[PDB]
């Protein structure tokens, strides 16, 4: 159940975690939504080679289950969003976990908030697509977060 999020010039795809046997259909979905880059915020369970050969680069940036991303991860993520969307406009960034509903939506939400979207509007925008995202800690984290308007 892949989820697409569109705001301003930004496009994100929050997807599931595939297996090595399902890789081809997975790549079909990515290519369908125009996914340039994948960020895995959890354990890496599948070989990226076929994904690389298809022109899709995979970044592995895990952080703690049920936890906000670290400052370094945030900076790398914002920089990544900027460069990738300036490099090939209209393209899509894929973020996925194994577990789901906490971490990847936190990243996407951060991107939206930096895009100027209000906190509550961001959380609501996400939960409209996937119900139950954002546990307590992550909620309060998106609340306390100070956007740099990047």
């Amino acid at each position: 159940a892949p989820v697409e999020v569109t705001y301003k010039n930004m496009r994100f795809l929050i997807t599931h975690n595939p297996t090595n046997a399902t890789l081809n259909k997975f790549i079909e979905e990515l290519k369908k939504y125009g996914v340039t880059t994948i960020v895995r915020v959890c354990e890496a369970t599948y070989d990226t080679t076929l994904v690389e050969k298809e022109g899709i680069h995979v970044l592995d940036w895990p952080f703690d289950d049920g936890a906000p991303p670290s400052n370094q991860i945030v900076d790398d993520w914002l920089s990544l969003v900027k460069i990738k969307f300036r490099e090939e406009p209209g393209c899509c960034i894929a973020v996925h976990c194994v577990a789901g509903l906490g971490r990847a939506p936190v990243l996407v939400a951060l991107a939206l908030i930096e895009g100027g979207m209000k906190y509550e509007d961001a959380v609501q925008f996400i939960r409209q697509k996937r119900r139950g995202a954002f546990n307590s800690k992550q909620l309060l984290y998106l609340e306390k977060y100070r956007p740099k308007m990047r």
Binding site: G66, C97, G132, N135, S136
Partner: protein, 150 residues
């Protein structure tokens, strides 16, 4: 008496949820995806009296498919065809619904589709990890109807 019961149940379709009328997971009749269809397994499936059976792999809560008994039509017991294989041959949509869904909405969804069955799930917000969808059980068209006609 019967008419009044039906009318009352009709009025109760709005307040009641799918969680109220569902069959809890542990009491659901299921079959593992590792099943080999031989004379005995197919005979057991037939004798069960179920038209559609959920297929799980690993945990019972992990439900990967729907086996319709009619799918077994031209299968030969001597071939010992894995259930995994046979489930691929037919497309039976696997629907999921949240536990607080009202019965009238559920009845509507059952009416539009060809699916008489849905997996009940809840949002699990207990920390400190990422929130996740927990499978509670299974609700069928039959359950709703039985709720109506008492």
């Amino acid at each position: 008496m019967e008419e009044l019961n039906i009318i009352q149940g009709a009025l109760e379709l709005r307040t009641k949820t799918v969680e109220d009328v569902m069959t809890p997971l542990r009491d659901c009749f299921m079959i593992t995806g590792e099943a080999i269809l031989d004379f005995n397994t197919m005979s057991e499936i037939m004798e069960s009296g179920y038209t559609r059976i959920p297929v799980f792999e690993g945990e019972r809560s992990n439900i990967v498919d729907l086996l319709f008994v009619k799918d077994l039509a031209f299968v030969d017991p001597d071939d010992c065809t894995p259930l995994k294989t046979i489930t691929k041959f037919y497309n039976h949509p696997l629907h999921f619904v949240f536990n607080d869904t009202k019965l009238d909405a559920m009845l509507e969804e059952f009416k539009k589709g060809k699916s008489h069955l849905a997996i009940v799930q809840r949002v699990n917000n207990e920390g400190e990890g990422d929130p996740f969808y927990e499978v509670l059980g299974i609700v069928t068209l039959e359950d709703v109807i039985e709720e109506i006609i008492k």
